[PDB]
Design a protein around this nucleic acid. Structure first.
Lengths: 38, 176, 158, 175, 371, 101
RNA sequence: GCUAAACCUAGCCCCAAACCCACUCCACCUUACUACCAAUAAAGUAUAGGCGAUA
RNA sequence: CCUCCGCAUAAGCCUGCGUCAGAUCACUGACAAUUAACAGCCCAAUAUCUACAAUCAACCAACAAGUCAUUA
RNA sequence: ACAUCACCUCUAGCAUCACCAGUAUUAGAGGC
RNA sequence: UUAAUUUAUUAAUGCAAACACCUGCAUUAAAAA
């Protein structure tokens, strides 16, 4: 377990870095997840 | 000194301390900016005392002597803030015509939703601001499908709500 | 971007094909804008050039869907603005040639307001409009001063 | 991926460079004849140290000329304190060159062993560069020399391309 | 964007918005200049409008510059004769047994053992830790002689002293910027060592010059320079005459350390610079032969290997390649002990081995000069 | 003041002044033995050490000699009927050593 | 007689109609929630099709 | 009577045997706490300097050829 | 075991993103 | 892989176009279905 690693791969910045990650966040926002990212 | 954090020693352990009405907004509108200033600090001291007492009562496992006056002080300070804020915005509307103190804009973030972006203070202008220019205030065409699906989700929630209201009205008319 | 059959027989496989044009880096002269433009074109572009008798006539004649080029519409907008403005900056200290060229394209003379919005993508038009109606909010001080002056005028006439 | 190449230094430097057993990289100057700033024509250079280099098979020489040191690649008998002439003038006759100096191929006795051969005038020395290697100047025509590479494939280069004479150092790297 | 090419129309950009937009043209922004001066974000002017930018490039020898061949560059750069070995005068200061500390050898041995073994909590003191301490302790041992020679009350050992000195050789402009520790200052100047006959015999000498590398190599090219001779103190300062420059090579790593030849060149140039600053302060900026040549000595150390220099500066007309020349006496590779064992090896006990007290005797002689 | 934007300072600019401070304070009884000159406060998260010093000195005329601060972590180990964690808020504790003995 | 059983109403579904949402203050693309720098019908008709499955 | 364990830091975890009160081989509610010197959190530019391993670094002993610096 | 030193086999006469800032006593592709 | 037929491509050629790159039309192989 590592916080640096976790925030590097699944974090908000990494998600928004690409259109695929933006789509992940959009999917999770449509579903209503409390946690959209790490 | 530090005695102002506690009320008069004659009231310690009295279990009921008498207090008067809280300031209304209308009453505070007739006072000067300086009277509002000093009254603010008077209320600041009073609230600090009451918070100190509340915490100490929690610590001693005893009920607070009179918790209503804390609410009254809080309401008084909210009224004072409202009065001063009204004066500030009236003056701003007069001199500048602006309705809000903080500049902002209607922007459209990466997820395609309209937001009110509030501006920040910077030293360098925006075109050489490395961090600011990383933000995306536009949506690419892959968002519009998700925008449509969110719209449909909202529509579903509204339809359910309106239908449920109508069913409840039918039940009410049935009983009565 | 299409598909074909392997040997022009439908009993063969279906395989993907792309048909690309032949691009020529040619160089033209817009007389009305008075500029040498290097442009990537096609042989067909040269043919409509020949039939239209000039880059100018070709640009102000060919409609948007037939031009299918944003650069073509930038050229169109510039040309139509230069006509509408009667702009003396085409050929300074040379009025007879300016008048000759400007009369040569009297047909495509348009109002300047109409020429301003020609060839604009929708987002570009919204950006122009939002500049246009962006005004600093007029302070309520002068509104109220004018109202008070007006009320005093009304009371004076009473 | 996050691959940024270490090959990122711009200026020529005499110092080793941390590159990505661990090794540091000594920048070699293969443009053997380069006149320095506000100098031209041939120029002498001095060998300060003949140094082992991890990045390659041959060993190298720290060689200082005028106001600049530089790493060049060593020939077989090159000592510390040796003096080497980097020449440009194509002589009318051949030049009876010593073991380690660099001349345009027009200025060599034909049938001598050369190394660090260019491909264009101003290209830099691309070939005959590994340990103990050598190539013999076979014959030359008008503005043209023909080389025998150690793979015995002959090469037609211009006359005014600089090559160094002698064979490359660190012999018996093979054995 | 091709809209920038059309002579008529102005491109529509995202400058109205305060953000980038992929479907609008990129605006052209004016070069922004911050109105006020803020130290943390200062950009210096490019190297032309500095108030002192001289076309004639100057060459600076600072505390870092490691010479190529070494000593030869120092003699050439200074036009100085090099005589191996200190003169009879200095060595005769310790010729007698009376000019000696009580339990001299043992005392020096104890200083060594302190520096190398008994210094810190760390088992093996490192070079930065034991080099300056060896130096300072040796000066303290030497200063223990104030009983015999009271004149030693008129000298001080000042640190963080920087001097500068400018001189021309042929067409090359040279400037030395000495920034080194442990400079010893005396109220009284050092008497001349070289008498008339040796300096008048140095004329026949020709300084040997080398090739192909220019005798300017590895010195700092510097175009933003000031031709200012700085002796390192304000005027009217007591103890104004330099006596001995103590320079130490205290880098742990071998590459980071000066070679002994390079260190000797270091001290030659530093002593020359000190003497030249003194000469210019006492005689003005005139290139002449001094009737009162200035003598300044230096002690260079690696931590255990010592070197001694005595410099006699007698000419200020450096530009010429003939005439009288300065002269320096050198003692080189004067190691004060061969090795030091911090752990017993199993055979050889902890301590120094190869301790030779003549090196410290020379140290003491140099210290007692002018006393 | 809390929950406000602060005007940005630039070199040679006017002193930042707060006219109606927004953060409020309580002095709480220490949970452990403390020196005689130490007074313990519970303080808002945004309020700094300099802010607390100036606050006491100005509003309450208390001569302050030293201030120390720590952030106390509230417990997240307690749950609803829905197995959802309930947070006790974190808070700031200030230790004020009074001046002039 | 223990365990247990039983309960109606939260809400939801399908339609109709009508085109929806989105700045208390503050914070949030950097490690997010971080004050601040380079119809119907025609009709399964005509037609297409390893002329067949089918279309 | 065991001790092949322990004590700190790092990483990770996040109040998870402190006090008061209650229920439950014989957790819940409330209150309280970790105080910087340790450690994070750095650096004004423009050029321009950075050939010689470590191993007690002195020999020896080598190869796989090395972990280190400024000036105006 | 693979890798990797080392060894064997085959290919390659050459330059700026690997090979390579290398040049057939070399490099790459394999195998152990 | 020397099943089916094909070369979408990639590497080459040959021929058209243009005054080598780019394009269109055929052929030969590797890697491919």
């Amino acid at each position: 377990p590592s916080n640096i690693k976790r925030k590097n791969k699944h974090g908000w910045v990494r998600r928004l870095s690409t259109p695929a990650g933006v789509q992940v966040i959009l999917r999770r926002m449509l579903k209503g997840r409390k946690s959209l990212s790490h | 000194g530090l005695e102002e954090f506690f009320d008069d020693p004659k009231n310690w352990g009295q279990e009921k301390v008498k207090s008067g009405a809280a300031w209304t907004c209308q009453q505070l509108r007739n006072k000067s900016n300086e009277d509002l200033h000093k009254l603010w600090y008077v209320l600041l001291k009073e609230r600090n005392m009451l918070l100190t007492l509340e915490q100490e009562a929690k610590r001693q496992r005893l009920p607070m002597p009179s918790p209503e006056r804390l609410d009254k002080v809080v309401d008084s300070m909210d009224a004072l803030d409202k009065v001063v804020q009204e004066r500030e915005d009236a003056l701003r509307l007069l001199q500048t015509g602006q309705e809000r103190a903080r500049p902002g804009a209607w922007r459209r973030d990466i997820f395609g939703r309209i937001i009110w972006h509030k501006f920040k203070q910077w030293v360098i202008p925006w075109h050489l601001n490395k961090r600011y220019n990383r933000k995306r205030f536009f949506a690419l065409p892959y968002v519009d499908h998700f925008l449509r699906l969110e719209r449909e989700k909202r529509a579903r929630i509204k339809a359910r709500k309106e239908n449920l209201e109508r069913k409840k009205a039918k039940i009410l008319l049935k009983k009565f | 971007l299409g598909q074909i059959y392997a040997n022009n027989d439908k009993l063969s496989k279906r395989l993907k094909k792309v048909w690309k044009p032949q691009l020529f880096e040619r160089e033209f002269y817009s007389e009305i804008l008075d500029k040498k433009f290097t442009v990537t074109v096609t042989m067909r572009t040269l043919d409509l050039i020949d039939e239209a008798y000039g880059l100018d006539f070709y640009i102000l004649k060919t409609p948007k869907e037939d031009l299918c080029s944003k650069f073509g519409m930038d050229l169109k907008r510039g040309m139509l603005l230069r006509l509408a403005r009667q702009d003396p900056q085409l050929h300074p200290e040379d009025p007879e040639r300016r008048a000759a060229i400007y009369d040569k394209y009297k047909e495509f003379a348009i109002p300047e307001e109409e020429a301003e919005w020609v060839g604009l993508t929708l987002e570009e038009a919204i950006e122009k409009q939002r500049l246009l109606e962006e005004k600093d909010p007029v302070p309520l001080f002068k509104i109220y001063v004018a109202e008070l002056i007006q009320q005093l005028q009304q009371q004076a006439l009473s | 991926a996050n691959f940024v190449s270490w090959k990122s230094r711009t200026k020529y430097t005499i110092t080793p460079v941390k590159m990505r057993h661990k090794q540091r990289y000594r920048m070699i100057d293969f443009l053997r004849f380069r006149p320095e700033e506000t100098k031209s024509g041939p120029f002498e250079e001095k060998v300060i140290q003949v140094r082992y280099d991890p990045c390659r098979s041959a060993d190298i020489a720290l060689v200082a000329g005028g106001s600049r040191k530089r790493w060049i690649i060593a020939t077989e008998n090159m000592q510390a304190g040796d003096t080497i002439l980097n020449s440009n003038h194509i002589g009318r006759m051949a030049v009876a060159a010593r073991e380690g100096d660099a001349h345009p191929l027009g200025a060599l006795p034909v049938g001598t062993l050369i190394n660090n051969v260019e491909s264009e005038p101003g290209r830099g020395a691309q070939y005959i560069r590994a340990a103990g290697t050598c190539g013999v100047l076979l014959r030359k025509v008008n503005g043209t020399a023909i080389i025998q590479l150690p793979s015995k494939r002959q090469m037609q280069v211009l006359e005014t391309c600089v090559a160094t004479v002698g064979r490359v150092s660190n012999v018996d790297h093979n054995k | 964007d091709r809209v920038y090419e059309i002579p008529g129309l102005e491109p529509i950009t995202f400058a109205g918005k305060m953000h980038f937009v992929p479907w609008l043209a990129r605006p052209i922004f004016p070069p922004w200049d911050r109105g006020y001066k803020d130290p943390r974000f200062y950009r210096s002017p490019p190297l032309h409008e500095h108030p002192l930018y001289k076309d004639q490039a100057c060459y600076i020898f600072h505390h870092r510059c490691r010479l190529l061949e070494g000593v030869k560059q120092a003699l050439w750069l200074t036009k100085t004769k090099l005589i191996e070995g200190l003169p009879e005068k200095v060595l005769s200061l310790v010729d007698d047994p009376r000019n000696h500390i009580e339990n001299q050898d043992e005392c020096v041995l104890n200083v060594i053992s302190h520096a190398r073994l008994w210094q810190t909590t760390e088992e093996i003191p490192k070079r930065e830790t034991y080099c300056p301490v060896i130096v300072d302790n040796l000066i303290q041992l030497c200063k223990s002689q104030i009983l015999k020679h009271p004149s030693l009350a008129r000298r001080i050992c000042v640190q963080n002293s920087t001097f500068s000195a400018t001189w021309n050789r042929e067409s090359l402009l040279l400037q030395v910027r000495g920034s080194g520790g442990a400079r010893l200052s005396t109220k009284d100047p050092l008497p001349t060592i070289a008498s008339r006959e040796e300096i008048e015999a140095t004329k026949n000498h020709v300084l040997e010059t080398f090739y192909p590398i220019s005798p300017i190599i590895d010195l700092h090219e510097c175009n933003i320079y000031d031709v200012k001779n700085d002796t390192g103190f304000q005027e009217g300062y007591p103890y104004p005459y330099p006596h001995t420059l103590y320079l130490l090579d205290k880098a742990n790593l071998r590459p980071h350390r000066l070679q002994p030849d390079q260190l000797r060149a270091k001290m030659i140039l530093f002593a020359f610079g000190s003497a030249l600053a003194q000469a210019r302060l006492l005689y003005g900026n005139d290139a002449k032969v001094l009737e009162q040549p200035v003598v300044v000595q230096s002690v260079g150390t690696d931590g255990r290997v010592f070197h001694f220099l005595v410099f006699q500066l007698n000419t200020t007309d450096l530009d010429c390649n003939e005439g009288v020349k300065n002269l320096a006496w050198v003692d080189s590779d004067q190691l004060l002990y061969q090795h030091f064992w911090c752990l017993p090896v199993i055979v050889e006990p902890v301590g120094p081995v190869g301790f030779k007290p003549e090196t410290f005797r020379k140290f003491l002689a140099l210290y007692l000069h002018g006393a | 003041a809390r929950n406000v934007v602060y005007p940005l300072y630039r070199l040679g600019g006017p002193q930042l002044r707060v006219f109606r401070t927004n953060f409020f304070i309580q002095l709480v009884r220490p949970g452990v033995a403390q020196p005689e000159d130490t007074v313990q406060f519970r303080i808002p998260m945004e309020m700094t050490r300099v802010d607390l010093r100036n606050y006491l000195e100005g509003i309450y005329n208390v001569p302050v000699a030293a201030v120390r601060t720590r952030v106390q972590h509230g417990s997240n180990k307690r749950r609803d009927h829905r197995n959802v964690r309930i947070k006790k808020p974190d808070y700031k504790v200030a230790y004020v050593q009074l001046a002039h003995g």
